């Protein structure tokens, strides 16, 4: 767990009566977006979305643009095929999502590769962890499996995941080193708001942290609480960092029995916080 990942996320959406399907891709290293492409843009091109990628030459942007354009066309055929496999009408909108990439350890070695697909938000077919075989969700996906085996796609995906995917991720980690291999710890505080004259809300905050993975837990007398607690989804601040909070409703006068425990990669040691009344 000085580990890193590269992921690409492709979204193709049909829109009958409103043109051909839109294709969008984005690429990430860990929680940092670095590229996009949108087939609806005035002139569709792979575009940089982080400072460290801007140095890549015109050959990089041109090649990758060509790749997304080819993939957009092929997703359109996939979408037509999938509509037939499920005996669906021409009138409805459908989504084909793709997500793929590689995970590496501290040393740059491949830990795991991924290449999978969803249709209308439901798992459809996935390259297994072996990078040689597929898991299909239903009889429709079994047809896609048969086509993928005939074209020997798993072999080619294995070669991309073990090769280019890891070599490029290593390159990005070195070029964006100052941000991508920096953990920013959370800045924390606990607030207190009376609800009634017999209960109060304690809210434990974490701000300014990177990467997004964090755990915030409230204990009462040192036992984890999930009762009378609210925990919001980790959310982006817009300056690359993340935010999260967890709250618990407590009996007035019992605040000192409650502690907020914070774990993050940026922290040498987990924190234990309490509310401190001014």
């Amino acid at each position: 767990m000085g580990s890193h990942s590269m992921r690409y996320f492709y979204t193709s959406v049909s829109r009958p009566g409103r043109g051909e399907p839109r294709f969008i891709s984005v690429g990430y290293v860990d929680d940092t977006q670095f590229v996009r492409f949108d087939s609806d843009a005035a002139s569709p091109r792979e575009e940089p979305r982080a400072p460290w990628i801007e140095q890549e030459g015109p050959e990089y942007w041109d090649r990758n643009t060509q790749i997304y354009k080819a993939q957009a066309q092929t997703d359109r055929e996939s979408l037509r095929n999938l509509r037939g496999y499920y005996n669906q009408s021409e009138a409805g909108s459908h989504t084909l999502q793709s997500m793929y990439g590689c995970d590496v350890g501290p040393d740059g070695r491949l830990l795991r590769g991924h290449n999978q697909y969803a249709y209308d938000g439901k798992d459809y077919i996935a390259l297994n962890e072996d990078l040689r075989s597929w898991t299909a969700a239903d009889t429709a996906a079994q047809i896609s499996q048969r086509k993928l085996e005939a074209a020997r796609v798993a072999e080619q995906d294995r070669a991309y995941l073990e090769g280019e995917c890891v070599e490029w991720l290593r390159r990005y980690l070195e070029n964006g080193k100052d941000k991508l291999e920096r953990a920013d710890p959370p800045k924390t505080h606990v607030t207190h708001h009376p609800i009634s004259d017999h209960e109060a809300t304690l809210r434990c905050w974490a701000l300014g942290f990177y990467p997004a993975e964090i755990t915030l837990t409230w204990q009462r007398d040192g036992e984890d609480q999930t009762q009378d607690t609210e925990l919001v989804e980790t959310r982006p601040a817009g300056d690359r960092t993340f935010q999260k909070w967890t709250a618990v409703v407590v009996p007035s006068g019992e605040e000192q029995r409650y502690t907020c425990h914070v774990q993050h990669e940026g922290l040498p040691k987990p924190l234990t916080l309490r509310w401190e009344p001014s």
Binding site: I67, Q71, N81, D157, Y160
Partner: peptide
Amino acid sequence: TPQDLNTML
């Protein structure tokens, strides 16, 4: 860099 395959289902 993205995969240079254009895989159909």
